Curated annotation (Swiss-Prot), chain A:
<feature type="region of interest" description="Catalytic subdomain B">
    <location>
        <begin position="226"/>
        <end position="288"/>
    </location>
</feature>
<feature type="site" description="Not glycosylated">
    <location>
        <position position="442"/>
    </location>
</feature>
<comment type="similarity">
    <text>Belongs to the glycosyltransferase 2 family. GalNAc-T subfamily.</text>
</comment>
<feature type="domain" description="Ricin B-type lectin">
    <location>
        <begin position="369"/>
        <end position="492"/>
    </location>
</feature>
<dbReference type="GO" id="GO:0016020">
    <property type="term" value="C:membrane"/>
</dbReference>
<keyword id="KW-0479">Metal-binding</keyword>
<dbReference type="InterPro" id="IPR029044">
    <property type="entry name" value="Nucleotide-diphossugar_trans"/>
</dbReference>
<comment type="pathway">
    <text>Protein modification; protein glycosylation.</text>
</comment>
<dbReference type="GO" id="GO:0002639">
    <property type="term" value="P:positive regulation of immunoglobulin production"/>
</dbReference>
<keyword id="KW-1133">Transmembrane helix</keyword>
<keyword id="KW-1015">Disulfide bond</keyword>
<feature type="disulfide bond">
    <location>
        <begin position="382"/>
        <end position="399"/>
    </location>
</feature>
<protein>
    <recommendedName>
        <fullName>Polypeptide N-acetylgalactosaminyltransferase 2</fullName>
        <ecNumber>2.4.1.41</ecNumber>
    </recommendedName>
</protein>
<dbReference type="GO" id="GO:0051604">
    <property type="term" value="P:protein maturation"/>
</dbReference>
<dbReference type="GO" id="GO:0032580">
    <property type="term" value="C:Golgi cisterna membrane"/>
</dbReference>
<feature type="modified residue" description="Phosphoserine">
    <location>
        <position position="462"/>
    </location>
</feature>
<dbReference type="Pfam" id="PF00535">
    <property type="entry name" value="Glycos_transf_2"/>
</dbReference>
Length: 492, 495
């Protein structure tokens, strides 16, 4: 067994290098030439808040077993992940690093790293995916605490202690670092924002939200305190090993990638635990836009199956909002979920409604009877209040997909509302400007209907259509319904 | 004295009507022909939330003295204001209606209304303005509670009781209705949004803000509860008369119009009271875009003087952010403020910092050492994160004056930050996209400086300037500094 600095990087990485004139992105969907130029222990900036840097860390903490699964990872990235763990962590807190080789083309990618101090490799005999691979690693772990990392990460200074501190104090906390960005094109290590929480839209796709201004102000007195998060990214976290086992590990029927982060996040929160982001812990990750590896049956379908298994188990009736956003998903078969359902019963988990009220209250929930919702689009332009209030005109600006003044709904009452203001036909003469006024269910002047395959908006009981021809010279108007481009509007 | 329905509207309004062929907007800056067509007690829609419509209050409420000041008001609007008070209020709660005629051209506009039940008229011998006029009315008032209304309002159903209920329960509350819109062109009465609070930007100009999503959720269990507001619009409110006197009435040196709403709002909050909007109370107001009346020295100057008197007394150091937004104001003389300053001392009022933390925390406040702040504007476009986070490109969208992704600062450390992300020069080759990255004081790639009279942004120690030419085809870039329009950028506040 070899100490990490004595490992021959050139011998390991050389041989698998990008051949003169070939595509440097095809193998990994990140730039392998830039990854391969880097030293295995390359220096990275210290992206931690200044208060983290002066803190002296407890080291009388339980040791962890680090589990890293991989399938056809670039050698340089995989080695660098392993050495960042070894170099940046107090040695007595790294029990072992378990590499789960998930049926990589070349078994040597993993096996050669087995010579490094503390590294143990487990090879899957066939492709199993990240969920089953992680469980295999977790089942082999000897330590009290599990750390999961992707195979293209770089740990920053004193990344580990702040995470272990949390779980040592309360075993029901599942904790994450701030995930810095390793640029997929140039491999620069870039400090992320510390002001984010994880979350998702009803399509169940992970996204980062900024904290609210009031959340940020409430932290001004300790800006590096833990941040409770509705959802973790899912690749990088630390969890008490027995807690992981007792909560049901992962759903063993999820395949290759996607959705397991949903499932564990809902499960942890609903069943009595918590999820945190720990600002003093910084780890870089190579974010990419595309997957480099195979999906048995296409990635659209596998993601949908995994996501459905999460939704059917955890979301109660709120699953229907997922299906409302992704109707294609109702047709993807998902398999037996009985063991998961009984796991939920066994654990006395709270309902999804509780999750929404107590964990993720800032997730906007549709009125069950809303007809349409979101932005109202015409070309690249979007219906916009222009910051106006009651008795104000309405207009368009370029769609920014950020809500605010471009948030609308078509209601059960047939009104096109923003907040409690409704598009109002003040005057039926063609060319008359429409106005924002307080919504009233009885006001016929506020009734609208979609027509011509949800491509236009007609004022109910008239032949007037919403029209943008005067938008930059007074505001939106009502015009006689006709073939013009200025009367095309679609909710999205 | 005559009951309001026996008052001859046609005789009062007729004679001052818009003369055959003349401009119907010149006299009032609203459409006088449309105002004059209306009955004095015309029906208006009930714009109250449904819960208001079935609601009881206490019922032993203190009566109010209604004060309405006016200068050259349209007779039809003035009459209609008075009759809406008389018709829509329980008679035992209207002690009197005091009309303060602030030196109108024709003294008969007011005097003729003196024949109406409960109406008392006080004429100023010279022009005094709304602040001094209100105080005169308040000083004449006999009731426990004051109600101030403009001379072109229309009270809606059960407008008064919900307001009096609040001040009867706690005399330190100064309370307002939701102010519905009476359209200045057609005089239609339009229901306003109930989801607003008053506020202001650093230019100290009143504006309406939507409540936050978390404020709205916390009200889901009683959607017509009082709404605490950092600032009132200022025309329409109710206040315990003794509380009004004890807090210092209004600043008697403010002239004609503007700024008194700032001053009373800061004073009430800082000195122990509160400000509320009461959704069950609805009153329409003729909003207009221009003033119909004279300002001794121009309206820009009078507004600035009044505003400065508010700022110098109440805002402590935060006045400098007002001056940073309106540098022209540092040159407007404001007069002696000593009585106001001692009033502040006498009352043990809290500092403006307290106001910002506890009353108006959603007003974005620059760091004391920030160089510049706000939006970064180029024409009608604004620097925008595009919802991106670290390692993301940056761009522009049309300025929406709503903060969010168009909020920036130029810091003590020379960085252009949004949240804890900073514009970062990743690559110095001209045309290279800039990126958002976590702010670090040591990173020379994040240093920027204003040049050419605060009209551009140059990357420090280079001849590269922030540039928008690739904004819709990749993002903002760094380009060699030159005379192009795509390199013009101005912060809305410069210290
Ligand atoms: O079939 C698979 C697919 C992915 N992975 C690994 O699981 C982790 C997460 O995958 P990826 O980084 O592709 O996901 P992302 O972080 O991009 O969402 C990485 O270490 C992959 O090499 C794996 O072991 N088997
Ligand atoms: O010098 C003045 C200016 C205004 N007013 C009256 O004060 C009220 C407030 O003025 P205005 O409605 O112009 O303010 P706005 O609501 O337009 O801000 C009105 O009843 C005016 O006629 C007055 O008595 N003296
Ligand atoms: Mn990854
Ligand atoms: Mn007014």
């Amino acid at each position: 067994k070899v100490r990490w600095p004595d490992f021959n990087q050139e011998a390991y990485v050389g041989g698998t290098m990008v051949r003169s004139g070939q595509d440097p992105y095809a193998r990994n969907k990140f730039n392998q030439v830039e990854s391969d130029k880097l030293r295995m222990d390359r220096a990275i900036p210290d992206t931690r808040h200044d208060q983290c840097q002066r803190k002296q860390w407890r080291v009388d903490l339980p040791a962890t077993s680090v589990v890293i699964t991989f399938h056809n990872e670039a050698r340089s990235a995989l080695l660098r992940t392993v050495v960042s763990v070894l170099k940046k962590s107090p040695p007595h807190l790294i029990k072992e690093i378990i590499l789960v080789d998930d049926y990589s083309n070349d078994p040597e990618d993993g096996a050669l790293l087995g010579k490094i101090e503390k590294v143990r490799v487990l090879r899957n005999d066939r492709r199993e995916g990240l969920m089953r691979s992680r469980v295999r690693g977790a089942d082999a772990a000897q330590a009290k605490v599990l750390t999961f990392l992707d195979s293209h990460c770089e740990c920053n200074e004193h990344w580990l202690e702040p995470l272990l501190e949390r779980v040592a104090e309360d075993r029901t906390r599942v904790v994450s670092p701030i995930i810095d960005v390793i640029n997929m094109d140039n491999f620069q290590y870039v400090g992320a924002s510390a002001d984010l929480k994880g979350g998702f839209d009803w399509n169940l796709v992970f996204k980062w939200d900024y904290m609210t201004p009031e959340q940020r102000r409430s932290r001004q007195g300790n800006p590096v305190a833990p941040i409770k998060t509705p959802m973790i990214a899912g690749g990088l976290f630390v969890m008490d090993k027995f807690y992981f086992e007792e909560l049901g590990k992962y759903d063993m029927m999820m395949d290759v990638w996607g959705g397991e982060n949903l499932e564990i996040s809902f499960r942890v929160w609903q069943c009595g635990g918590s999820l945190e982001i720990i600002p003093c812990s910084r780890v870089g990750h190579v974010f990419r836009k595309q997957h480099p590896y195979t999906f048995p049956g296409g990635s659209g379908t596998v993601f949908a199956r995994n996501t459905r298994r999460a939704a059917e188990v955890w979301m109660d009736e709120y699953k229907n909002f997922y299906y409302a956003a992704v109707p294609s998903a109702r047709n993807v078969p998902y398999g037996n979920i009985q063991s998961r359902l009984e796991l939920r019963k066994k654990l006395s988990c709270k309902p999804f409604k509780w999750y929404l009220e107590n964990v993720y209250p800032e997730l906007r929930v549709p009125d069950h009877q809303d007809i349409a919702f979101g932005a109202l689009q015409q070309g690249t332009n979007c219906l916009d209040t222009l910051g106006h209030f009651a008795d104000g005109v309405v207009g368009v600006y370029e769609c920014h997909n950020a809500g605010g003044n471009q948030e609308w709904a078509l209601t059960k009452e047939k009104s096109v509302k923003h907040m409690d203001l409704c598009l109002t036909v003040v005057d039926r003469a063609p060319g008359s400007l429409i106005k924002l006024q307080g919504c009233r269910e009885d006001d016929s002047r506020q009734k609208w209907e979609q027509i011509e395959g949800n491509s236009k908006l007609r004022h109910v009981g008239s032949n007037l259509c919403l029209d943008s021809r005067t938008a930059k010279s007074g505001g939106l108007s009502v015009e006689v319904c006709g073939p013009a481009l200025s009367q095309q509007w679609k909710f999205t």
